[PDB]
Symmetry: D2
């Protein structure tokens, strides 16, 4: 059946912000759903008065934490599903993904010797681009639950604007849980580290990670021995992110800030931070213009065809004021290319004077199709791209700022390798992703161990 919401019935935007927003959205937009303009407008009119998913003073705080990242005084961890679905938007799946990110944070905080800014891909990662409008079954392609349905039939693939509302309801629901969990006990550093201790005990490669787990453990005991005040160990902040892709959803989630802090700006309150993907980063297109008008922190994906010069253009358009950490540039090159392609981008951007975050995405450049027909990534390539991203920064004297991974708390079978030795035949058991293969819980924690050893190197 259906539930039903009302299309509703206040000071207008500041004149310059109206002008600028309309000039942004007048530009060409790639990868947009194709539904009618009237039905879209009704849906945006619903979203324009819902309670936001985030609030501006959180975005201001995240921006300050990311400036520390940009200055080399913190490390950025971002991860969660490749594609959230409505049907898997459930308490166990959310807790599971929050717990996996947390588990990784413990180990990276200890390896980096500095705070880790924890950013979940969650509460709105419901839209994807596609290179092909017709997929391999010859159906109109799945573009994520905010657009159409996974089910491999033609009605299910029709673009349905009512998905904008269901996507918001599902997002704000998740966010409520993520906040409940982070403040009420899941994020206690003691509990989360006990889980890491249970992984080291049962993992097939646990003997390799025992020494570092033991050190963290004596580190934690050292704290209670010296009598530190411990409430800061009880809770952590998990922020929300997703690809800003569907411009009808992002424009309708825009809100003007109150001016008490800074003079009023437009924040996208569908998320704390958002990024712009490889297929939508046209320099003069609507997504880059949009990013330029919102106050949030933003990132741009940079793949193997990126030039140093285009990089610098992104930095000048998106960090026009030189605000450390407003712009993250998220390298995804493939492990076999990172060490060649990244260095001259980093040099040209470092010489601008701006302070970007350098972030490694070691997933999206390392995808292949298995003999068994599944889209998969090999753990050792994902690892090796991070290795090589660390080598580039070390050679340059610049900061390996963080990683951006697709992970889950579930024990799926989606990426090959790890300690578990996920084989091509194994992929059949629990291939559950609605899009790209994610590291399972064990694989994601193994990678934090390995990355903790790069941070220590």
């Amino acid at each position: 059946m259906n539930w039903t919401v009302d299309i509703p019935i206040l000071p207008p935007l500041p004149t310059d912000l109206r002008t600028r927003l309309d000039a942004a959205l007048a530009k060409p937009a790639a990868q947009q759903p194709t539904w009618p303009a009237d039905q879209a407008l009704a849906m945006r009119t619903v979203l324009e008065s819902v309670p936001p998913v985030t609030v501006p003073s959180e975005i201001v705080r995240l921006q300050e934490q990311l400036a520390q990242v940009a200055k080399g005084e913190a490390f950025l961890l971002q991860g969660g599903d490749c594609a959230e679905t409505f049907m898997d938007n459930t308490e166990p799946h959310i807790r599971g993904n929050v717990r996996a990110l947390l588990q990784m944070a413990v180990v990276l905080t200890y390896g980096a010797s500095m705070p880790v800014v924890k950013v979940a891909r969650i509460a709105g990662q419901y839209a994807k681009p596609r290179s092909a409008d017709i997929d391999a079954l010859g159906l109109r392609s799945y573009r994520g639950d905010m657009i159409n349905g996974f089910a491999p039939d033609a009605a299910a693939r029709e673009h349905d604007p009512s998905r904008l509302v269901r996507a918001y309801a599902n997002a704000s629901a998740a966010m409520n849980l993520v906040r409940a969990l982070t403040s009420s006990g899941l994020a206690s550093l003691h509990l989360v580290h006990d889980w890491n201790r249970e992984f080291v005990r049962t993992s097939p490669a646990g003997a390799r990670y025992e020494a570092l787990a033991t050190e963290i453990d004596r580190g934690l005991r050292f704290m209670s021995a010296c009598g530190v005040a411990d409430r800061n160990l009880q809770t952590a902040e998990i922020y929300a992110s997703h690809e800003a892709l569907v411009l009808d959803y992002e424009r309708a989630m825009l809100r003007l800030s109150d001016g008490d802090d800074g003079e009023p700006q437009l924040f996208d309150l569908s998320a704390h931070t958002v990024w712009i993907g490889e297929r939508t980063r046209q320099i003069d297109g609507a997504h880059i213009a949009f990013a330029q008008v919102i106050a949030n922190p933003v990132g741009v994906k940079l793949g193997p065809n990126m030039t140093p010069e285009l990089a610098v253009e992104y930095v000048e358009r998106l960090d026009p004021h030189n605000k450390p950490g407003r712009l993250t540039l998220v390298s995804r090159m493939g492990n076999h290319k990172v060490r060649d392609l990244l260095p001259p981008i980093v040099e040209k951007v470092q010489a601008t004077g701006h302070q970007v975050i350098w972030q490694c995405d070691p997933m999206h450049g390392n995808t292949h199709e298995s003999s068994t027909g599944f889209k998969t990534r090999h753990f050792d390539r994902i690892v090796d791209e991070v290795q090589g991203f660390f080598e580039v920064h070390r050679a340059l004297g610049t900061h390996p700022g963080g990683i951006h991974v697709e992970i889950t708390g579930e024990n799926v079978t989606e990426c090959l390798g790890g300690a578990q030795d996920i084989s091509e035949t194994d992929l059949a058991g629990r291939y559950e992703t609605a899009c790209d293969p994610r590291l399972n819980t064990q694989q994601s924690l193994e990678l934090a161990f390995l990355v903790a050893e790069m941070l220590r190197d």
Copy 2:
């Protein structure tokens, strides 16, 4: 018709607890909606797998804080809209209401000299009883947005079980925002006190309250002067609550904690109303089975003996703070009716919270046709509630009020001297008349003196 339809798609609680629940839910349930069972079932099935509004470790913490209230070492402040509506579940309304709680809370904490457990009527108060089969307009009565529409038209008033899911979405989106605001600066004690100072400055009776405002300011500066660490001044906990009325909604929102007890995860704490508190009815049998702290409204027809049976039913293990008895008597009846009830419950050896709802027994109709409440009657029920406890050496434990951040004209009186003619300007409640933001801060100050006195 200016709507948009949102499609619904389509492991169970344990057998032993399901067997206990179905036994309790075979009891007759008053005031339930009349939708088809098969549609109710469908909608319960959706809600049995949605992410929860609250989590068990939050409720367990609330129980600890409420235990401290029961024992005379904390004060319970519960307030917000009489009735939430889906169309007024907006960011400025929700903020406004949190703001008004928080401002009352600063003044009450200072006046009590102890912590204040801050519980909003919010993120689910979407259902109400009715006495009237047919309202004045000859329509089926409005029952709250979880049941039907406010709109005085026959189609709006048919009972729609899909509203179960709309209520949930609106409840979680609301709770998301309440969490976000109370963690990220709205619950800064300094900033909330600054709003209290601007009220004292511009209020018409602001002269009367200036002295206490200045003492608070100087109690604040004293903290800074002594160098205390300040992060616990930066944020506050606002718990969620509503009347537990729709048993289709409340049972679907049940979850087992991870150990393992049954919690209702639609709210932190829920109460049973004056019309559904049958000692052998399902609402009571539901309150019995859940581990959340629970409240029961006790109006002027209550007997000591019946208030005891509530205690034996709802607090069988003698957990202080688990049960809150909520007096609502009328200002003219509190001093007489409440003492016997207190004496007899105290004598059981159980520690209940004694909370005053000075709103619901003090409602009258104005010559201009609006349902309304005098400000002075409301105050004087609290004053009396206080006298009762002082006389008996028992704890005046908290209050339960209907308030909003908005500058409505719903209750008469207060410093603004809302008159019978002012009622029409902004009377916006979908149900009972609320204190507006000014009247609710004024009531906090006046109660803060009863605590000091």
Copy 3:
């Protein structure tokens, strides 16, 4: 003769700082003792290698706190005995005096709404000037226990340089105890406030002070109610001070910090008296060379121009809080004499602390023969000091008083209404009349209102 002799046994400061010191110390020094140079030297040699009374990082912290006082963001409270004696350097006396500071401090912190830098006249105040060549009894005048004996007999009054070492031992043993008491529970704010409550309860004017006592109590409970972390309520810092008078003692106690500047490590902060503040004399040239915060007493003969030369000499680098100008004018003269001095020093652009000593210009002789001070005159000098600063928009920075924990009868008046006849009962000071414990708490309350007013 009821004494026991304790034998004395027997790498230097750097050449460049020793060359600076000897240049400054070639200046004439008033009020110095008349013992043989060779004996002075011997005794300086002992004191140049003894463990220090204070350490440089303590003084550096004091300078930071005193900077905050200079800038109008803290208040300076300095008090204790006019003259310490070796035979009254006992555990109950020392505790009593710390106790009396700390109680004044609670009330001043609340009344100021900012932190209070707590500096005792203690652990070295063992030397005094004299005007009189020959006292009334026809004896050489007593000069303080670091110089000679109080005992009115010719042998006691000969200047004994071995008293340099006795002073040091008594100073360090005293400071040991002050550190121990302020770390281990005597400086608990709660417990100190409890003493303040028992004073309000038993004092004859306790009625007058009850309201502020109750506000403090409620500002305290408010902290607990808000859950602040409390370790900074458990202890307090009490710094040491005395008049820097015996240059043989003060120069021997010099040390280089470890980097490197010169500190006098006989005290945290030291002041120059009204009789030794010659602009070209050695006391001033000594204050110039040390890095400690310093004070200069400014009596009714001071000129604006001379108070400026103190600023240029003693605060050459413009370090706020480094220099404290200590007004002591008489209550009848403060309102007239002080404003010009403030205007002219302010105009230099330097930030000095402006501290009131309401004791030394308000001393009179009673018909019963005792040196005494009216309580009301003392209060009214502070009141005036306050009016002066308010008028000019400058900071009334602190006070400097002579107080003890004991229930002496030295100053007239106060709530106890000490009369000319009461003076003989317990007049025990070896020098000037002190506020007793009651009168000193009474003065804190009354000053706390000048701060609130």
Copy 4:
């Protein structure tokens, strides 16, 4: 020359405390100086109204911290000079000894994974017993500066009661400094650990201790990474101790407590805690009786002739109320005997039901005379006694509670071995002790490293 103090001119002691104290001091007392009774009494009358060196609420606190020790929830470190002197009672020598104890504490806190109760032998360790009244030069023996002079001449050796006063003045002076230093910066955990980092860098055996120093370092950085409240890292408490030997000094430093906490008792305020030595622990003698009347925590030295049965008698006389941590029993057996003699003492005392602190003194049973004529101890024996004290407790299931060592911050040449390889010829350079050989600063820190590895084992 001389300085001069006055022999002075209040509620009498509670009748039972008078009676008990006099009954204690009526018993025979070994090792007491032999000066006239009238001159003694004058000196005690001076001491009876001086400001105490410690106060009762500190002793109450230390007792609570030592009960945690007794329960196995903390570790006790006690050390400083074998014999303080008046002439070396100077700022550098005191800071030096405080710094060395601190440096050791950092490493033991981290090794134990639990707090360390820091107890200095300081501010009154001015008296020693002697087996011989005539020494090897045929002079009346040196008994410590509270009794007579080190100088090897007969006048200097006369017993001089005025030394009771000079001993107090010197003690309270030191204590004032120790308190100044602990609260004002010397005891910052960051500074003290930087010093440990400089030792590991320059020590000849530094490469052996680098790994553990590095772990502590990442542990400390882990704390700032997680944002702990850090004032508890700024300061530490150093307590005062010495051998309670001279009964004229200890009786005159007795003070009655105020009753606000517990009902009034006699505390010895010359120290926080005191111990009774091998030569003065006669079961029915004045020192054991004295210890029984004061409220302080106490210890008794136990050497190789101790029986399990006599041990239990000490426990029943000195911990009559079963108060954990009131009684420490301080094993000194010699490294070659500890593993044989300690176990049956521990079993008999454990079976009483009382909770003593078990403390290792690995110095006093391990002393020998070198070919070069110096009293010396070999580092490897001192180490091996601690090793063996750990082995006894591990085998029993009981708590290796702490160590009691003689150390200094100076780079003296008094104990053979260590990383520095202090040879018999080396002892000549800087043999500075007025009594037994102390570990120098480097040797004391090496031993903390080694003991930290026993705690980790």
